[PDB]
Ligand binder design. Sequence first.
Ligand SMILES: [Ca+2]
Ligand SMILES: [Ca+2]
Ligand SMILES: [Ca+2]
Ligand SMILES: [Ca+2]
Ligand SMILES: [Ca+2]
Ligand SMILES: [Ca+2]
Ligand SMILES: [Ca+2]
Ligand SMILES: [Ca+2]
Ligand SMILES: [Ca+2]
Ligand SMILES: [Ca+2]
Ligand SMILES: [Ca+2]
Ligand SMILES: [Ca+2]
Lengths: 141, 141, 141
Amino acid sequence: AASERKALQTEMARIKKWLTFSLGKQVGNKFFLTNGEIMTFEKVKALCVKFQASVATPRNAAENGAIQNLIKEEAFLGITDEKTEGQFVDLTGNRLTYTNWNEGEPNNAGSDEDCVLLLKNGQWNDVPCSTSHLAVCEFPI
Amino acid sequence: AASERKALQTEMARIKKWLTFSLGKQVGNKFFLTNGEIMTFEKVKALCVKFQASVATPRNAAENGAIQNLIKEEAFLGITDEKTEGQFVDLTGNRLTYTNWNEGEPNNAGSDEDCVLLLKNGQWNDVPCSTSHLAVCEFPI
Amino acid sequence: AASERKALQTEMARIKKWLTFSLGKQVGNKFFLTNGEIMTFEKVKALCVKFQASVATPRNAAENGAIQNLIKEEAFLGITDEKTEGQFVDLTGNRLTYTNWNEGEPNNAGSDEDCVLLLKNGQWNDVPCSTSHLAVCEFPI
Ligand SMILES: [Ca+2]
Ligand SMILES: [Ca+2]
Ligand SMILES: [Ca+2]
Ligand SMILES: [Ca+2]
Ligand SMILES: [Ca+2]
Ligand SMILES: [Ca+2]
Ligand SMILES: [Ca+2]
Ligand SMILES: [Ca+2]
Ligand SMILES: [Ca+2]
Ligand SMILES: [Ca+2]
Ligand SMILES: [Ca+2]
Ligand SMILES: [Ca+2]
């Protein structure tokens, strides 16, 4: 009967189990993944979008730690103050409820730091959007 | 007809081929995987269990080498002598038929070394279960 | 109705999306993957073949860069001049249209360099086939 379909769904459920265990980090309904490539902010934006994903945007400590665990280099976050200087916000325009700025940040040094960078210790630093950093996308899971 | 089902099974077989090639190490009916996180023994136990897997327990040189190849840091094994000091055993209570102790091991230093650690060279060292080391689970494949 | 089949195909399409994003590098109809193990050329050949894949053979800059991005160590390419010294060719006998030799290469040093090695900077160097290097296979995607 639908024995095949039964086996397909069972096979899929385990493949998905493996992936969430070792391919990336799952926190709720988000799945953080990196292609291991560094590029400018606009590029990462296009990239994630190209995959039906969005740039990783930690909305709480758990997510921040998850991204922290995943990365081997500083990664751009889906946060900027491009439109209103000093007012950091989501790629959807939503203001942040959780922040983890590094000491002395944000400082908008050189009057040109509108992007945010997740550092290896989990802290953040505002950096120029034109710099090249690790691409990380959150996929809906 | 069942052309779709045909394609689904073919698609699944190749996805599985990719995963066994680059996601982890397959040795017989075991699939070794790591989430790249270090934690205490009890945590790793819970973790693997949480994924229908068990802590990696090499039962022969091939498996030991496979785990060795997979890891980038010392990993806990599913072996302990908690119940009977000096008598190392499986998470199922089965005694070991294969061991790869490091020189001078096991020594049960500090009278508190009931867990086993796979070192980068494949050799083993008994360590305190309360230490934090890389999590590795063997999944049924 | 075929709601399941619908869901299976949707589930598969996203699993495939994740894999092409983080498991390997896709360039056209090729999917480059590495098992992270170093071995002699003949071994890598057998390995890829064993997986219905072939040794990675960059046929253009995009592919070369893709392989370059993927690797953490020097990787053998599916190119040799075993049959006709100096005449480098595909594993299918096809002559190369794209090459990226390193300065001073190829030199066939020691009169025993019939294999090709992709270096970390993307350049190539002819090396003895008996040396052990990273295995990389291109899978049909
Ligand atoms: Ca600004
Ligand atoms: Ca600090
Ligand atoms: Ca700013
Ligand atoms: Ca700054
Ligand atoms: Ca004891
Ligand atoms: Ca030793
Ligand atoms: Ca002990
Ligand atoms: Ca010891
Ligand atoms: Ca020759
Ligand atoms: Ca050079
Ligand atoms: Ca030669
Ligand atoms: Ca040479």
